[PDB]
Design a protein around this ligand. Structure first.
Ligand SMILES: [Ca+2]
Ligand code: NI
Length: 88
């Protein structure tokens, strides 16, 4: 299971189980830069459970190498995650 690097903003739609990594999360307080998901079985980031929950990027601790390691699992065509900036 290799973590595939991606850049923000990032979203994914549909079923499957995927491993992604990024170093692009906000580390300063910004309630506009968030992660959200729905209809997932699992969304874990650095061992923290965010499955189907809204969280600001700055609330998610990085790993000790400065990356965020994301494990996604969904079983539906409308399973979804997004990691992005609030448009307003
Ligand atoms: Ca990057
Ligand atoms: Ni605008």
């Amino acid at each position: 299971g290799e973590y595939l690097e991606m850049d923000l903003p990032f979203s994914y739609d549909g079923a499957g189980e995927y491993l992604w990594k990024t170093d692009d999360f906000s580390t300063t307080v910004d309630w506009g830069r968030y992660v959200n998901s729905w209809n997932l079985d699992l969304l874990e980031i650095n061992g923290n459970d965010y499955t189907n929950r809204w969280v600001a990027q700055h609330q998610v601790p990085p790993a000790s190498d400065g990356y965020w390691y994301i494990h996604y699992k969904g079983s539906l065509a409308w399973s979804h995650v997004e990691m992005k900036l609030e448009h307003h």
